[PDB]
Design a protein around this ligand. Structure first.
Ligand SMILES: [Mn+2]
Length: 263
């Protein structure tokens, strides 16, 4: 039985829905850790040796631990599952890694993982084909109604404001503008800028996220006369009893919370 190692929980969950136990799906940065601050362990090196295929986000998400993907099993490839996604920069600059926060991009992650699994395990092509389409429609069925309601927002309430720049791909996909305090899980000028921008556009809400502090968002809410919108799930699946234990649940939770704020 082949073993497919995903770099973090969001990719591991997508892969599990495409492979459904045809392969063993493992995860390096488990739910609760972010990629942004992950220490590769000895036991992790075992997961890395056992991998027949390694699925990374790319867009520099794994930059600090790419050096551990070395001395690999012969024949083991590293596949970047964001292939085909036009990068959004962090400033000409380093890419923003959060491409999975997008309904369009969900379909591209699924397609790239379907393609990689099928090249790895061609005798199950028909099953990965079927599973990928079923899962793409599951995502569409849950998420498209959220998109539909949020597209009703008045064109000057079209702002997603967060702490980390975790929604830039969502903004691009749905036609909104972004504002945030720092691109990747911090600087005084970016905070000053967000405060100014919120005041000039009369922005009503700012969120924080499940792996970072709520204090800068609450502070900005105060200074701008906006409201703190609460916590979004964007960088990691929640624990099993939390609200975002799967990638579908994560998109559904965070987009629900955004749309519920904008109306
Ligand atoms: Mn992040």
């Amino acid at each position: 039985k082949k073993v497919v190692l995903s770099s973090f929980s969001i990719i591991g969950d997508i892969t599990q829905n495409i492979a459904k136990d045809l392969v063993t799906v493992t995860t390096l940065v488990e739910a609760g850790n972010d990629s942004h601050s992950y220490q590769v362990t000895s036991a992790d090196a075992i997961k890395i040796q056992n991998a027949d295929l390694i699925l990374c986000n790319g867009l520099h998400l794994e930059e600090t631990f790419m050096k551990y993907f070395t001395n690999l099993k012969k024949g083991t490839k590293i596949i970047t599952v964001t292939d085909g996604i036009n990068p959004i920069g962090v400033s000409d600059s380093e890419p923003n890694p959060h491409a999975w926060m997008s309904l369009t991009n969900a379909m591209i992650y699924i397609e790239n993982i379907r393609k990689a699994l099928t090249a790895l395990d061609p005798s199950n092509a028909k099953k990965y084909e079927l599973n990928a389409r079923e899962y793409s429609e599951k995502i569409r069925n849950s998420i498209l109604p959220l998109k539909t309601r949020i597209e009703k927002v008045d064109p000057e309430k079209r702002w997603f404001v967060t702490s980390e720049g975790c929604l830039v791909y969502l903004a691009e996909d749905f036609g909104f503008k972004s504002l945030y305090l720092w691109p990747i899980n911090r600087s005084p000028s970016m905070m000053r800028h967000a405060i100014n921008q919120m005041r000039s556009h009369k922005i009503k809400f700012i969120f924080s996220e499940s792996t970072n502090s709520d204090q800068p968002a609450k502070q900005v809410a105060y200074e701008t006369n906006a409201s703190y919108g609460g916590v979004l799930y964007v960088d990691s699946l929640s624990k099993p009893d939390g609200p975002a234990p799967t990638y579908l649940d994560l998109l559904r939770f965070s987009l629900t919370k955004i749309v519920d704020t904008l109306f």
